[PDB]
Predict the 3D structure of the following.
Amino acid sequence: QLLAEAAKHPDMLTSVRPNGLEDTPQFKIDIDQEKAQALGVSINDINTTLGAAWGGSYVNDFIDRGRVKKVYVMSEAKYRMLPDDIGDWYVRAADGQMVP
Amino acid sequence: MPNFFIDRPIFAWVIAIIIMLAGGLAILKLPVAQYPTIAPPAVTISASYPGADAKTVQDTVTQVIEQNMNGIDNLMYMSSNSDSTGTVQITLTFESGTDADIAQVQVQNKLQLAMPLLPQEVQQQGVSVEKSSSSFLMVVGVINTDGTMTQEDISDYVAANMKDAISRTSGVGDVQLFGSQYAMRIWMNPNELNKFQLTPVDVITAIKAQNAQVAAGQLGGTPPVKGQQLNASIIAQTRLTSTEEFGKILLKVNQDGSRVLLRDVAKIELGGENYDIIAEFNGQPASGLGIKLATGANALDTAAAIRAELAKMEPFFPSGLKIVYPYDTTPFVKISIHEVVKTLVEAIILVFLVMYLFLQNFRATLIPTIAVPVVLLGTFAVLAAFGFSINTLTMFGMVLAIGLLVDDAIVVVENVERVMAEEGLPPKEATRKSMGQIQGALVGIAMVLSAVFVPMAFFGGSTGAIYRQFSITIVSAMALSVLVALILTPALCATMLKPIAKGDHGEGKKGFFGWFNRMFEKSTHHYTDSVGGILRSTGRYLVLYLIIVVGMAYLFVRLPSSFLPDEDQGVFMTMVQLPAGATQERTQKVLNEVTHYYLTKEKNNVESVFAVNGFGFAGRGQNTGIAFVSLKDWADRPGEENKVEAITMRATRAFSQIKDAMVFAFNLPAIVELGTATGFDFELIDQAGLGHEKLTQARNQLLAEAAKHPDMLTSVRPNGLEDTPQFKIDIDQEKAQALGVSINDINTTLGAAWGGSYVNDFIDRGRVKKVYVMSEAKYRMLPDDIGDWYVRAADGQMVPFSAFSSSRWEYGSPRLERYNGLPSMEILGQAAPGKSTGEAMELMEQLASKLPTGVGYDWTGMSYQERLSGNQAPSLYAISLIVVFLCLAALYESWSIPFSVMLVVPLGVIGALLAATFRGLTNDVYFQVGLLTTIGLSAKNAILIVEFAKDLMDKEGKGLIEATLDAVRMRLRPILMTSLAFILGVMPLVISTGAGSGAQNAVGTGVMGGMVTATVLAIFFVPVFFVVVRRRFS
Amino acid sequence: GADAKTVQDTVTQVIEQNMNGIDNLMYMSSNSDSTGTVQITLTFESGTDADIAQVQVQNKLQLAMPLLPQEVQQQGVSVEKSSSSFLMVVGVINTDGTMT
Amino acid sequence: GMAYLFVRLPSSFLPDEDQGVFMTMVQLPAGATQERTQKVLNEVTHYYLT
Amino acid sequence: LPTGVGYDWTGMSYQERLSGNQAPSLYAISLIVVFLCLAALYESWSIPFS
Amino acid sequence: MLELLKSLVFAVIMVPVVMAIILGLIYGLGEVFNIFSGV
């Protein structure tokens, strides 16, 4: 409302802009822990897999040309671009079989 | 200089206007506080180890902290207190004058290097460093008057919707909370845990796994594939935010859908972090806040802002809540300001009245009324420029120095008036002659006062600051007053005087004036002939002087000495110490009895009782308790039978009948920052590594030995808690291993069932709070209950805890103390009502000398300050003596004349001691300051008389006797006027009833005695000393 | 991992509560991003020494560490006397295009 | 006349001067990716250099 | 704006407000000190007033 | 007002009596010193 009202006087106020990002849509992944535990998988494996694949997990350090730099582990672009790509990841169950 | 400004009145007026503007600007901006930074800087480190006894906390926590806290400069002494509750406190007190904002960083940085060397539980709880020498500006209690809210609900409400606003006003520094916010409590149930084949470690693991936050990442990752247009954030699992969500945590799910929920095995509720302290205000559950004044802030404005902000919140206050103020310090500052204003107005009116009585001329009366406020504003400006504040001591110095300003004004005006009367010259030349005659004396007395008052500011410790305030105020007032007398006043004598004819001193008129002049002249003639007759001889009064000297010495030796008089602050403490092994129920019963007594048999005196159960100044635990009793305003407590002393004496006499409790009552010291008890603190330190039993036996022997002299030691009590029985559980390691039970499971179950474990954090109503796991009361409350817990073996079966564990009893100390790195114990207690503290200290040292070999003794707290009188040795008084001797020898050219001036010093000290002995007050700081002021006034009178006599002897050819008699005849009206002004102006100090009246009474009595006796016995004695000195050293 | 709402809810709330009270405090302003980072800028009254100001800020901050969430306690809280606008940015380029 | 002219005169704090450097800030619609921002910045720099 | 919403200048505008709110005190103090100096130096209260 | 009036009246009734005692000590000390001087 303030911006709309201030836009009405170009003779005194010019380039009246906010300072900060406005608002964004967000994505929420609902994990059904009931079904996951019934199948045989563990919550820790699911959480670690999701965090490492999509968020990237800092693991360790290594020397390179006499300098210590970090080693990162992250999914390769193509498989973390769309919501449907969440179906491409698999988690090992208790008995060794792999569940999507 | 004075004659230079006589011809230019407006130059002096401009200087006065500048001084007035500076004073106004200074009074516009100046910090206001009750007391300055008197206590030495102190830093306290607090750590918590939940469910750990005293020994575990002592060896595993504070040992490492104490070892790694060496190398800190300006460190005075360190003390350490462990506890059976699980809290450890290390207090480091530094030297006075050091910057605490750097010592805190030093100790914090040294602590951060020892963090990885501590156990994991204390690290998770976290340690905190803070400044304990700050004093509380006020405490705001909030109570529930219906019964819906409990202590935890009230504490969380304060922490959520009151702490931030109260902390975010103007002038408020640190804000402390006396309660703990909410925490999700998970009460196990051993029967249900056995039913589903579970152990507490399983619940801990499930909570850790299903109550975590995971960095899901970001849709459309940071390196994008060629042709991406969508980008958003992924919100994966988050922390649980409700009890109903915590109850749905899975613990065991099979493949066919069968499941076990956390609510099926445990009770989830929202409680507090620790149920150790129960606070009840007038019988109702309550919580509190402690507001400390920030540095360089106005106390009154901050208090008013706090009150307005608190009164704003009532419309949004939920349910039934009430806000009370058990203890605030603003009334003392308001009273001090009111007393300053009253003293100023009374002094102005009194000096105007006395000038009208004597000089009979209004133009003469009006001169000082426009000079004293100028000096007052100049003193305000100088004190602001130096860096001081408006305390309760600086204003006392100002009301003390008002008399000096009046004295200077009286001297100047009376000298000019008498010169005009006896010369016939008009105001101009008379003022020139008087100023030329008196400028040297004024400069000399200014230098003498500065030389006698400056060295008092070089004291160290708390006494150093207490003397510094008064000394700085007094020297600034003296300098400003003499500068005003040199510059401004001579112009006033030049302009605003009526040139009356000689001989018209009121004798031409009748009434009160002419008659009063008649007896004044008759008495002056009688006094002059009497002093001439006594001066005809010399050796008859030397024996009188020696008698006065020996009497003063005897009175000085006889008078008891102390540190600082007690005052009626309206708040006093009551302590309850139940026998060893007592639980919370008996302590609550005794506290209820005490509250009922206070609110029933003392309704007209007390106002509220803020009982605290579980916490005491001796040591925290389920065995002790405290109660802060506050009284009504001093206006509603008339007489000396309704003061703090009588109330607490009657209270302890009545409480002596309380069985199963040794309830005591006492009054907190006048300066709350320095110490908590009104008596000395004494500490016994093991050195030969005897241990604890030998130390306890030695302490008991010393206590019995000191109790055998009930004439100078009273209420000698220990400051710790006696040894208590303990439960020892021994686990058969090989039996547990043989049955298939891992030792880790047993240890975790025993530590999380009876001790309670802190697991994770969670978001509650938009804030971070801990989650705690512990058994549900009835299953952890008796030794037999240890058999109700079951542990899972490797085979999957559950083995009871009674199949591989035993139990026995032992004796252990619930509170371990350390001093300077060695085990130590503390005895705290006061002295007799009719003896000095120092004598009690010496006798305690002699008693400690009889202890078995291997135990040493030391002092701490105010006692250490009392032991810092090594600077109070004659090494400083002698320095002041030589400095004033040099100043006097420099003022007038003689190595022998200043002896006569110094001979008048005992003649005021004798009167001060007489007044102190009559009233019975002890020798303390305020009495010392008053004695110094009386000495200065007597020295001023001696300086004036001697200078006039020497000028008469030198400038003219007057003989010794003739010049001395003429001088003493001449310097009679100013002396009497100044003495009357001072004596009448110090009346309220002596007559003050209450409201911090101890210091006022002491200083007023000393000033009255000194002034009266000096005025009586200086006029008759100074000429004798002068003539004896001149003839002997002729 | 925590978004703007929860970060601003947990960390900077208590941090801002504790920071208030330091002498010659002119104004304090905080920002909470979406990548989890949180920033607080305390501007002091003119004439104050910045070094002792940082010392006091550190002293007041270390009191609030026990109240801070567990993850950020060992994440690393950095305090520094910094301005707003860059004094100078110096760029490095490749003159043959063989280096990305 | 002094009073009237003092009232008339507008107020400020400090004049702004040429320094040879200035800045440009670009804010795209929420949810925009790196490619669109790169295209907008390319437009801006091409205009500035042409 | 709707009730409960306030405003407060910050950064440069805070200093602009401070500069604009302290001028009259400076003017009055300077005039007073100059008048007092003139009165002290050249004598009489008529010369500085003129 | 009332407090100002009471302060004034107290001051004016206390000054003359105090001056009276001070003249009393002046008289007494003068006489005793005159008596003792001549032995």
Q: What stands out?
A: Chain F has one domain: 1-39.
